[PDB]
Amino acid sequence: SLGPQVAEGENVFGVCHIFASFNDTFVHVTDLSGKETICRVTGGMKVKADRDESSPYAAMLAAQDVAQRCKELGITALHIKLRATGGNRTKTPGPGAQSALRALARSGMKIGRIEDVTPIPSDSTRRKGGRRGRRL
Amino acid sequence: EDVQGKNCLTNFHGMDLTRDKMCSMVKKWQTMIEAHVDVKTTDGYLLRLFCVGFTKKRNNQIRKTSYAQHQQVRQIRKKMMEIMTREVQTNDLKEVVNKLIPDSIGKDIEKACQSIYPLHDVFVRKVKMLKKPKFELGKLMELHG
């Protein structure tokens, strides 16, 4: 949080990973290395019933909390690493990624490069479920 | 690799391409050529270069297929392997990563494969290292000027 830096000459850059699924959102913030984190706030820490974990409001609340904690610490700019469930399950990102990114944008931070790191495979592993899939 | 005081001096570890162009260059009604090599530089550093090449559709072309024969793909891949083998064996790490900043390797690939079949998007998709030798302080110090 402290050091010989100045708030006017430059800006502090970190890398934030947004895991968005259809069950929960992980609004994670790491350093520029990515090895060591700053604070990890998840969409289940705000709501009480898990049905609201996939709501955009939980992702907004988690993003606002981690963004206010980070700008209290002194990180001003963020690099976006959006990631869905991935693997063989689902390529489409969750419903809370847009809300989390907009809450990070409106908190007063700065946004740099945006890229997607969804783990698409090279047709590796058999999917969950039988030949007939899920019946409902 | 090492810190002197309050400074983290860095070194080359690999080259990647963004995923946006990786799934934006691929299109239907065109083919792909991929080559991978296990070449080692003139020092004790071993690299692994991956390459990708696509299909150029001509301006006066009415056909929408734009495919190619298999032996043309093999000849284009052979040109890719001999270009990537020839251009890095005589050079060290500094010269090859200086060449990696432009697309001169890709330009030589797409200029070598002109009389076989035209290519429109040639880039080096990935660079990986396998062999790491004994660390030298002087080589890293001279790498930083």
């Binding site: 847009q98 907009r102 409106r106 946004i111 945006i114 479920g129 899939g133 | 799934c23």
Partner: protein, 101 residues
């Protein structure tokens, strides 16, 4: 009776193709039978682009795009209303649906 000229798929001289999996379901469907949809999307949707460009440090920053390919079983495709049933005379229309915006 014979409903279609083909058999609802796109094999004419093969007899067997490799199977793929549905997205909503986990159903094993042949590749040439499944209704593909290569959707082109971007990061922000319609109105967050102004807020992103206001907060982006780089001026004239071009926005990235998300490219995924979606494979559907036909029951999950019709239940998701991406394809609808057509009349007997107008079934034989292989032209794609028109795009405007």
């Amino acid at each position: 009776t014979k409903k279609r000229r083909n058999n609802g798929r796109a094999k004419k001289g093969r007899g067997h193709v490799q199977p793929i999996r549905c997205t909503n379901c986990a159903c094993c469907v042949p590749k040439d039978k499944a209704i593909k949809k290569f959707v082109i999307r971007n990061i922000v949707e319609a109105a967050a682009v102004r807020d992103i460009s206001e907060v982006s440090v780089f001026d004239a920053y071009v926005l990235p795009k998300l490219y995924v390919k979606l494979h559907y079983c036909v029951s999950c495709a019709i239940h998701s209303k991406v394809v609808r049933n057509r009349s007997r005379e107008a079934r034989k229309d292989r032209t794609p649906p028109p795009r405007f915006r």
